[PDB]
Symmetry: C5
């Protein structure tokens, strides 16, 4: 259709978020559970720097994080004059899951939020930003072992669920471009109880071990 109508479609969809704010689960009727599909694709190691004279180190990684979830506020009927299958939207203009790298040595991993998300007419959002992750590794016997723990900061399992995208319970290596040998690569979804709260939080925990250089 018209490129005009595509922009108008975006503005109409975003009007709700502009008027009501981006905070809160993406439901206007019965509040349901958001199931977020999550993938972590490793590209390369930036650095691994021993901490002091001990066996630990700070591992800084370049990755691409993949996230998808359904936002019912962003649905539209794909017929004229809005006969579009999808539209691109800035992630800072919509609700996004507050999934953080809990064990970051910094505040959190950093995502490139200038990267656009794509929303399909059925409300499915797919957002695949580049990411920098910094964690505390153990460096022993020429092996560097690092873990990554992801979960929603404030939403428990009855509010935000998380599952591995495409059921792939592993660091994805589709974009891997480094020379380092991968020695261990596994991941687990677990529901973990925190002191704050009655309901468990979903943790996606990845274990990655690389041969030291």
């Amino acid at each position: 259709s018209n490129g005009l109508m595509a922009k108008r479609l975006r503005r109409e969809l975003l009007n709700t978020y502009e008027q009501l704010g981006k905070s809160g689960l993406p439901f206007l009727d019965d509040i349901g559970k958001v199931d977020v599909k999550f993938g972590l694709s490793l590209q390369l190691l930036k650095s691994i720097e021993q901490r002091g004279m001990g066996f630990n180190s700070i591992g800084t990684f370049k990755a691409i994080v993949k996230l998808s979830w359904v936002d019912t506020i962003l649905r539209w009927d794909p017929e004229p004059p809005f006969d579009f299958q999808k539209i691109e939207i800035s992630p800072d203009e919509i609700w996004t899951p507050d999934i953080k790298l809990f064990n970051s040595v910094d505040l959190d991993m950093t995502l490139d939020r200038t990267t656009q998300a794509i929303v399909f007419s059925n409300g499915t959002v797919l957002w695949i930003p580049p990411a920098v992750l910094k964690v505390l590794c153990v460096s022993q016997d020429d092996v560097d072992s690092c873990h990554f723990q992801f979960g929603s900061w404030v939403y428990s399992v009855d509010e935000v669920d998380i599952h591995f995208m495409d059921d792939k319970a592993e660091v994805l290596l589709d974009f891997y471009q480094d020379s380092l040998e991968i020695l261990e690569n596994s991941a687990q979804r677990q529901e973990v109880v925190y002191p704050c709260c009655e309901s468990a939080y979903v943790e996606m925990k990845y274990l990655l071990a690389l041969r030291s250089e």
Copy 2:
């Protein structure tokens, strides 16, 4: 019970802040005293780096800070159509305590202010952001000793009070993930008078000592 109603509730609660601004103690009626509950949870040590050739060092820590206080502006009756016991709100849309790390070697500790706070119907706010803390430690005889001093920057004890969350006067280790041995761990609340002002300011002072690597 509707998601729409939760979003409208938030907008109604935040209208006061939007109209009149976030600045000023969080009271509709006679300005009283905010009682902040404060907790510090150590996750890990990013780095400890000797300053020059002396016995001092810059210690950089990853922690989670727990903050709770009452905002009487954010109160509502949990009855239909606003039958919600709590809601999530961005901390940058409401008043938050100006609690700073006084002895930071930088301007202040940094908190992840993208982290959402939860507000309960009685106005209780609970906000638990990740934090990075950089302080000057003493590194002597296989021990690294660091202190952390927290307090409201501008509000005296008659305006903002602070007490240890759950009355635990210590660094909390519920999220501790590092391999360092903790040799000392204590904290104390004191009211301190400074040259600027007649009224005292509340200081939460934590002392932490770790076995060196």
Copy 3:
């Protein structure tokens, strides 16, 4: 007239202010944008060995050249709007989401304060300074580095990319360094990614430098 120029800009940008900058730059039928892309190397900031292995982080200063057609920004160049071109800030218009895929950081950085020039026919030419950081191979006194550029979310049906002036190599028009260039080639390829059926256009540059 100066006033007419500012008003022309405001008229042209009114669409973007009202509808937003997102979405392919078409007002009528949505076609394909064809971005012309150029990379001009100015200098190496640093190349730092990673650990004790044969890789290094290479940090480069370059100038990126981008041109495309935005049909929303067209005007008839007749009085009082008798202007062949105007200057516009890149953050006021759509710009292609071309990223350095293999950056060791989130992305390359471009100086987005640099103004773009838009001609009356809607052609935008924007030539920002850039800093690029990639993982190189440093072995046998040769530092080998690659750069992969492409639209992040738009496939070849939406955003295509071709070398500016058909020159499939790092441009040396602004080269101001002492390092000897041992290899300098580039390729346009359409690559299929896991996410999507339609291929994505990758501009891949190979650069090798004599080590210092």
Copy 4:
């Protein structure tokens, strides 16, 4: 007398700044001379790093800067319902002196501009932000000697004057927490003519010498 009236007071005072902007000397009526009271309190040294192999070094300091001046735009009569002796305001919502660290090795010192200023009913503003200062020091014979030159960037002495807070011509040690021996500590106010301008500029020049570690 209530929290709502305090915010309405703030909104009324700030209306002038919102409608007309923060630029310009802070006078409601005739433009007079601002007299800034200035204090510098050294907390600690973050680092001192030799430059090359010479006698100079980059000294990076954590300090607290104290600033007071009068803003006649922000005056009110403390009579009910605006019976407040003071209110807190963000420094980015009002005029603040453009006092910069002239000899910074970076663009300028950095101040924590999230810290609130306090404005009293007579228009006196007191703002005491933490600060990070980085200057070029001389490091010779076991002594590190550093200087700090502060002054308004664009306002001459007939527009913005500066004097030492409490008339103390020295680096204040009220907040000093470091283990370094202070060997020299002095300050002097002088009026200095720069080539740009007929009228002189007020320079607050502090000299600090510390024993090397």
Copy 5:
């Protein structure tokens, strides 16, 4: 004569820029040529670091850049009640020359854009921001040789012209505070043709050589 009237004048001057935007040469009638006077004042060297094991180095400098030009939009008759001969204005609220350091090893030199410009009633603007400049130098034979190339990014000589301030074709030493011996100091204004464009661009090229430490 009064503080509120000075703000009203600024608001009226800036109205054009707020309504029409800051982009485009500062003319409302016939579009002419802007003549920028440019001065570079070296204060000190932050660092000079050898690149690898070769003969080049990264030189990081603190300077003050002096810029003057005429903005015919910001003119006014200095008569009551706008009897002000100059006003201070934020450089982010008016057109400024897009003069960049072409050979910066970073994206560009950085200027402190919080620093106010002063506009005189005849439209002459004078803006003198602190600056940090990072360039690639040659370090050989105990001499560090560095060059600085400045010019407007998008405007050719027909649109923006540049000349040395006070006719001095050299790095100005009016603010020089460093101990380094300056062995070479010269500068040249040249019209350089670029591949993009028919009209030439004005380059101000400075040559500076220092004795190594």
